[PDB]
């Protein structure tokens, strides 16, 4: 009849949630301890985390099958981070991490297909099979870096470009507790502070007062199992850098399941029903199967593109193979 919106539904539109208070380092006032979730955002976050979760379980299956080779670092259990982080920033903001990057490649906008197909080393991977698990790039996503600690000065340098370019963008630079003793991290803290770079240094602490290791740089310690906690901390941190106050450290603690926590929140406050969420699960599974089928059916890239993309913006040239008689065309 048209008198009520076709999208009108039965549920609450929003609910207010309590989120854990962050421990603070050199900040008088941290992020709020309540936040508002909209039905629309909750369904979004729930679908995204669930997709990362099923993608990573699928990758592990393929890996055990020897279809993925070399490294295959997974972020299952950590979905509140990549999704939480994505939720507190803009698409025009920037993010870099180390090798545990499948989730961020997804939240930054690559399809499950491109991600799995790169893992299985096929021409339909996001790098046509040149990079594999550790080296994937996306829009304002800078990898996907295999040398532990190396991404942190990269991140600080992306943040210097943010400041240089004048568009109020910020950079989120992630590292794991394993890398927190890299000396180049402290070099980056010092230059970031000195230049007031909009760099959110983030330590993904899986399970040692990391958020205080920036010393002069302020820190917050956050519950990385709670997408809402991660979202608010991120918003606070991004707004901190955007105001011109310089860098800040965020320690995300992970180890209870982040998807289940959101699910219970959504059902108990009647933002969504058990049934809606099950149907999302069903659709997510289909997306992951289509992607896995394509990743395993897709051919390897052709041998004649072996030497492609050594240099950007150059005329074509020839690269030598295993002997001087083997020559590969290199095209930018």
């Amino acid at each position: 009849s048209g008198l009520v919106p076709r999208g009108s539904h039965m549920f609450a539109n929003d609910a207010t949630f309590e989120i854990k208070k962050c421990d603070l380092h050199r900040l008088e006032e941290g992020p709020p301890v309540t936040t508002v979730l909209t039905r629309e955002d909750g369904l979004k976050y729930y679908r995204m985390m669930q997709t990362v979760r099923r993608m990573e379980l699928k990758a592990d299956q393929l890996y055990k099958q020897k279809i993925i080779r070399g490294f295959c670092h997974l972020c299952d259990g950590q979905e509140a981070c990549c999704v939480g982080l994505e939720a507190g920033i803009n698409p025009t903001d920037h993010l870099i991490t180390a090798f545990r990057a499948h989730g961020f490649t997804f939240t930054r906008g690559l399809s499950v297909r491109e991600i799995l197909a790169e893992l299985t080393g096929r021409k339909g991977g996001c790098a046509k099979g040149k990079g594999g698990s550790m080296h994937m790039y996306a829009k304002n996503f800078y990898g996907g870096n295999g040398i532990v600690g190396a991404q942190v000065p990269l991140g600080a340098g992306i943040a210097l470009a943010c400041k240089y370019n004048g568009k109020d963008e910020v950079c989120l630079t992630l590292y794991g507790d394993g890398a927190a003793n890299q000396g180049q991290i402290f070099e980056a803290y010092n230059m970031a502070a000195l230049w007031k770079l909009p760099c959110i240094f983030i330590c993904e602490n899986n399970r040692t007062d990391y958020y205080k290791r920036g010393d002069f740089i302020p820190g917050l310690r956050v519950d990385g199992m709670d997408i809402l906690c991660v979202r608010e901390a991120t918003r606070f941190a991004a707004a901190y850098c955007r105001s011109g106050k310089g860098p800040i450290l965020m320690e995300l603690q992970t180890y209870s399941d982040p998807i289940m926590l959101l699910k219970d929140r959504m059902v108990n406050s009647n933002l969504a029903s058990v049934e809606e969420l099950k149907e999302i699960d069903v659709e997510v599974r289909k997306e992951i199967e289509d992607a896995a089928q394509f990743a395993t059916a897709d051919p390897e890239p052709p041998l004649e593109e072996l030497g492609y993309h050594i240099y950007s913006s150059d005329p074509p040239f020839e690269v030598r193979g295993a002997n001087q008689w083997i020559k590969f065309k290199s095209v930018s």
């Binding site: 070399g70 080393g121 003793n181 041998l303 050594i310 295993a322 002997n323």
Partner: protein
């Protein structure tokens, strides 16, 4: 009896530790049962925290620590998890270790061993596949060895630990689990391979083929294919990158009149470029019936996709091809 390359290195370190209390091992996960590539397995249980020492992920720092301990008279085995990671610590290797005995006028020796896998592995992509033989081999004050088989690795690791200067031992992760029959003389705790000497692995009359590390076995397989056609390859296992055994190479080329060098690392300014240059500079140049040629890895960062990777390292077929090209057959 058969012993894996991994087990041979482990025998060598075990024996050198037992034999001298000043020897210790340090690096990431060296004290853990699993344990990098399991090369140090069992050592911690036998020798404890004092001597088998896990480090944080701090390459420049723990390599500098290892070098200072050598300066102070101890005898560190410093494990890089791969040599790719040695790049973070490379100033310690070159400026603090290599150059020090010289700059000090013979006063300050540096009895340190840097060891760990070097070069290509399987599917680990461009940041984890780099060969450092030419890089290290270029440097005065270093010794640089590159074992192929179980004997090479036990005997060079023992010589390295006994040397009183910085020795880079470039191992091979694909070679670790490869078993070789281990003669009684290699089984002995007395077993040493002198640094600076090549091994002729196969005698031959038609062509000299020189390699190091894992491609050596590819060189031996190419040779076996080739003898079925009446082509006898003399296969030479370099063992030492610096000071390399050029006289062994020259003697062979003066007999066979032809040379192919084979390596895994990148071609330009690589190991074969030096061997070629020396051949051209010395007494064997006049014995060449054909120019010498190089088999190498492809001149790319290592790609991930298996087909691409397979075609980025020298294969037995690439070796045979090169050899036939040189013999014009």
């Amino acid at each position: 009896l058969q012993v894996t390359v991994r087990d041979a290195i482990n025998q060598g370190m075990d024996e050198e530790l037992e034999r001298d209390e000043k020897v210790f091992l340090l690096g990431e996960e060296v004290a853990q049962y699993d344990g990098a590539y399991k090369v140090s397995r069992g050592l911690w249980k036998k020798y404890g925290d004092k001597r088998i020492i896990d480090t944080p992920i701090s390459e420049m720092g723990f390599a500098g620590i290892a070098v200072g301990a050598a300066m102070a008279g101890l005898r560190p085995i410093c494990e890089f998890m791969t040599f790719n990671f040695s790049m973070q610590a490379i100033d310690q290797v070159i400026n603090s270790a290599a150059k020090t005995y010289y700059m000090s006028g013979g006063l300050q020796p540096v009895p340190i061993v840097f060891r760990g896998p070097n070069g290509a592995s399987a599917g680990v992509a461009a940041q984890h596949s780099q060969c450092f033989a030419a890089w290290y081999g270029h440097c005065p004050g270093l010794k640089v060895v590159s074992p192929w088989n179980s004997e090479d690795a036990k005997g060079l690791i023992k010589s390295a630990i006994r040397d009183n200067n910085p020795v880079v031992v470039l191992e091979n992760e694909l070679m670790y689990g490869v078993p070789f029959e281990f003669p009684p003389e290699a089984q002995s705790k007395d077993f040493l391979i002198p640094i600076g000497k090549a091994k002729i692995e196969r005698q031959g009359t038609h062509i000299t083929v020189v390699s190091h590390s894992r491609p050596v076995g590819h060189c031996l397989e190419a040779a076996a294919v080739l003898s079925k056609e009446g082509v006898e390859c003399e296969v030479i296992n370099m063992r030492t990158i610096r000071p390399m055994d050029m006289e062994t190479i020259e003697a062979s080329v003066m007999k066979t009149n032809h040379l192919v060098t084979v390596e895994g690392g990148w071609p330009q300014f690589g190991v074969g470029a030096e061997i070629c240059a020396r051949i051209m500079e010395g007494p064997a140049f006049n014995f060449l019936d054909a120019p010498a040629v190089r088999v190498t890895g492809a001149d790319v960062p290592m790609p991930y996709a298996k087909i691409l990777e397979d075609n980025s390292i020298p294969q037995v077929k690439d070796i045979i091809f090169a050899i036939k090209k040189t013999l014009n057959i």
